[PDB]
Design a protein around this ligand. Sequence first.
Ligand SMILES: CCCCOc1ccc(C[C@H](CC)C(=O)O)cc1CNC(=O)c1ccc(C(F)(F)F)cc1F
Ligand SMILES: CCCCOc1ccc(C[C@H](CC)C(=O)O)cc1CNC(=O)c1ccc(C(F)(F)F)cc1F
Ligand SMILES: CCCCCCCO[C@@H]1O[C@H](CO)[C@@H](O)[C@H](O)[C@H]1O
Ligand SMILES: CCCCCCCO[C@@H]1O[C@H](CO)[C@@H](O)[C@H](O)[C@H]1O
Lengths: 258, 258
Amino acid sequence: QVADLKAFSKHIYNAYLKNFNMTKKKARSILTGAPFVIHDIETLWQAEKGLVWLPPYKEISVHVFYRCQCTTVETVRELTEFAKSIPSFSSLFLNDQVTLLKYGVHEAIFAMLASIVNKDGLLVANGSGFVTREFLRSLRKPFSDIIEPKFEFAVKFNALELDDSDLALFIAAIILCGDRPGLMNVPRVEAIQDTILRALEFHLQANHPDAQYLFPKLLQKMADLRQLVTEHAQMMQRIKKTETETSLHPLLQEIYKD
Amino acid sequence: DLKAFSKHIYNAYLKNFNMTKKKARSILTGKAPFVIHDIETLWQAEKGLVWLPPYKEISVHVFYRCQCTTVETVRELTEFAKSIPSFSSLFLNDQVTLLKYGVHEAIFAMLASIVNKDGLLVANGSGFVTREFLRSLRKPFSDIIEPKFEFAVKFNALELDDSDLALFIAAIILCGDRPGLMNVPRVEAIQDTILRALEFHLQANHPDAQYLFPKLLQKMADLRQLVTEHAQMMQRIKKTETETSLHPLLQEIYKDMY
Ligand SMILES: CCCCOc1ccc(C[C@H](CC)C(=O)O)cc1CNC(=O)c1ccc(C(F)(F)F)cc1F
Ligand SMILES: CCCCOc1ccc(C[C@H](CC)C(=O)O)cc1CNC(=O)c1ccc(C(F)(F)F)cc1F
Ligand SMILES: CCCCCCCO[C@@H]1O[C@H](CO)[C@@H](O)[C@H](O)[C@H]1O
Ligand SMILES: CCCCCCCO[C@@H]1O[C@H](CO)[C@@H](O)[C@H](O)[C@H]1O
């Protein structure tokens, strides 16, 4: 079957290249040399006034929080199209497709954020802006609480030096997850995941021949991402409890609803 | 535009439903199906003339075949809906909400296409099961069958064709007041376009018909009441026929209906 794994992997890579606005390849060329640097209120206003780029304005920390929601909505759209282009995802009934996306998108999002991140900050607005990690840390709690763990995960994840062909299989494995709550056809999803994981293992052997233990390291990263999302959801719950004037986008209300 | 909108819907209907009312009406008149009317003819139909959990008994076997046709028709309705203008632009969870609360209304309307007052076409029309036989089945399983014939006979008196039904079923699915809908304004907007298209189409297709468009709006309300009563019957069967299986997709559909 191993020669069908290579074609399986290539189909997933093509779904990735077709559907995601930013690749790690493009992002890393931007980050190595230019993006307008957002590092304080004045540069953020500059960036919004046209140099780089929503519910009614509230304050700076809430505004950034709203922009975080907008990127999640847009990435969910891309992840949905990516998943629909995956072998046998769209053969599942639509409710199973929604269940897999509901519980998988944030795990995928936080892994993909690593592609547009270095230790100093984050690419925004199609790579035309760069918002500094220090500026994001300087925001008001509880909003700054959600930021730093994602940088901490991303820097360690980027040390693995994956490329876009690796990430396409990695993201596919995150989505096709058999133990999501309320899944209808568990055996079918488990079977698809096993095929992706076998394809991923085969791909890493060819693409990273000298890398030690890369496949089990990635399996651990998938476990770390589930914990990262658990902690993130807890922080989102505190924001919902304590920041009642701050809006939550309807799509995110449905994702975080129990 | 409005003609083109209708034509897109009609083509999606022809592309996705194998049995049209045109094909069915040829068979039912004489332009032949093996008649299933008792245990022996059903056995002959299963043995090869015409065509699941382990056999329990006659009434449960027919009940299982009803579930199988629903599962298959839901697959077709999903693909039909995905080809509707701006349905696919809805977020996937709203698509599922519309299908969850819409498929049985559409199914019972489309059953009229393959039904006369004497029975029902089965297995691509190769078989014809009689209303008398279905009435003879054990309670509570017989309880679900007769109200569908009652609706279908009166619905067939309107003499719609496949071009009409394509818009009618699109209107059923794109329904703005389904529980838990996320983007109600967007759905209401598509629904209003379909209803205008339906009225515009009926003027051309049935110029001499009196009050046909409000007649069809009332049929949509009748279908919602028919499904409410059917769902209550199905929940009682699930309570009283504990050894009878319910397909997982039907389990997810009827979950929260009252
Ligand atoms: C590791 C990078 C920093 C952390 O970024 C995060 C953190 C959590 C989330 C998850 C969101 C939070 C509402 C969700 O729960 O869906 C998204 C981003 C993605 N954020 C953005 O895309 C973003 C976009 C614009 C701006 C800004 F400052 F330019 F406005 C700041 C941003 F963090
Ligand atoms: C107006 C036509 C008669 C009533 O048919 C009904 C009634 C309710 C339903 C809804 C189903 C019931 C399990 C659902 O809840 O999804 C489906 C059919 C559709 N039934 C079938 O497709 C069917 C198929 C095969 C056979 C038989 F007898 F040949 F086995 C009998 C059948 F009624
Ligand atoms: C195949 C399209 C028609 C499928 C209809 C079945 C929908 O079931 C619903 O699936 C949702 C997850 O997507 C769950 O959140 C709901 O609890 C459940 O009721
Ligand atoms: C676009 C794909 C991403 C969608 C993720 C959001 C899914 O939300 C869920 O949608 C279901 C209806 O389908 C509801 O039954 C659930 O209550 C709700 O939690």
